[PDB]
Amino acid sequence: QCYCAGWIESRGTNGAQTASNVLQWLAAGFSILLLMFYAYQTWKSTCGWEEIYVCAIEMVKVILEFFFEFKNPSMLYLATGHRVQWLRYAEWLLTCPVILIHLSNLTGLSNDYSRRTMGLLVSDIGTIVWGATSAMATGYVKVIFFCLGLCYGANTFFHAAKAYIEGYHTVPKGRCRQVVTGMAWLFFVSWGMFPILFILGPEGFGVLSVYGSTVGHTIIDLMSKNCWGLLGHYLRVLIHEHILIHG
Amino acid sequence: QCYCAGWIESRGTNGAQTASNVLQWLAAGFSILLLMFYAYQTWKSTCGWEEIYVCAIEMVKVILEFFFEFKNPSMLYLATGHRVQWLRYAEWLLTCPVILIHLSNLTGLSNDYSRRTMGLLVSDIGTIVWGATSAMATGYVKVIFFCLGLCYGANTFFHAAKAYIEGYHTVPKGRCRQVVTGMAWLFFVSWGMFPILFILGPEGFGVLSVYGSTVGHTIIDLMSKNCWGLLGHYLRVLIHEHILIHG
Ligand SMILES: O=C(O)CN(CCN(CC(=O)O)CC(=O)O)CC(=O)O
């Protein structure tokens, strides 16, 4: 029984809504098939938990978004008049660190993780924390928290780059290196889009609507989560296939 | 310019307010002196970054709480009528993982971290995510998210226990083991209090007021952050002092 004009602002156009709904179905369907494929491998082979955990969270998230995107607590309706997509940011904290853990052991071989991994993980959690806080903020305080996100974010990209470069030199000279390069390209483009979409969305300058932001986020979600995971899985398969033959 | 009855509910009694304000000063003062002490060691000795990073965040957080506890985005005022202490939960995501990273290398000696560390870190981030979401939630959905927090939380405590036990056997037989036991006692009591305070506070059954919850949280913050860090530092010092003499 609380009233605010901002909570009733348009969520976007019907086309954007329909586009958004359509991409949820695709995301879900693609996630189920990936989950089936990974589960199929777990029984008949070895499969990293990172690919599976991330994909299960992604499947659940699109289902939850489809039904509850605009209901609390998946969207927060603040006394500032603004609406914060908490489901978006919550999901990042669950999935992004696991992706970075996957990135710290690209070959799947080692049991150990370096000091780089810790610095990488800490900087990414902070990035999300600052970004979420910025979305909740109002006025110039919003710009300050976004800047902290960029600082933490730059640290994450820096460490990530190093992991990719060390990974490139660590993997064997043929297809494996081509795959690592593909993973790096896919990673930096998709991860780079997130801050861009933030600026363009309601939390930023409101160029995009809620539905419009959702459309864009679902595409880069598929890129960063499902596709990158599938590539990383394929890389791990190649490493296994190579070591048997070449030792 | 939005109206809601819940946003204007009492924050607590004047005694609770005053108690809360007093503990902020103590927390800040204690954090500054610890920061000075750690900084003093960095120039004149070796000092782990975990103790320092955590303490710097804690000093900043109490300063921010003192001035801005009830201002957005440090408190979220939701269309549900409820007020969510986002500053509390944001701070946990920044500091708790670093504490667990410290816990994964108690002796300060190794450069590597095991698969336990990753599982420990992932489960703790999730715990906070579910807990924060529960605080934002309303009705029975709140109970479901809290349960997910307990599941993730139990996993964290399980792995933490193992780290403590392996750490106990790894450290030398005298004072070092006594210190690890002290750290474990301090850790489980302080960490266990968080879910208890959550239930007792406004986000739970509202036995405690906002100020009352703040009082309790500041005490366990000092226990879990500053004191546990100081003990962990002391342990690392003992390991160093022992290895020179005993190899
Ligand atoms: O099947 C349909 O008609 C579409 N869905 C989704 C419609 N959504 C709007 C949206 O998110 O696009 C309803 C809602 O989220 O409240 C129905 C439903 O959620 O029961």
Ligand SMILES: O=C(O)CN(CCN(CC(=O)O)CC(=O)O)CC(=O)O
């Ligand atoms: O010095 C004082 O009088 C106390 N502080 C704190 C008073 N607080 C209330 C509280 O949090 O206890 C003011 C506020 O947070 O708005 C003054 C100030 O913030 O400028």
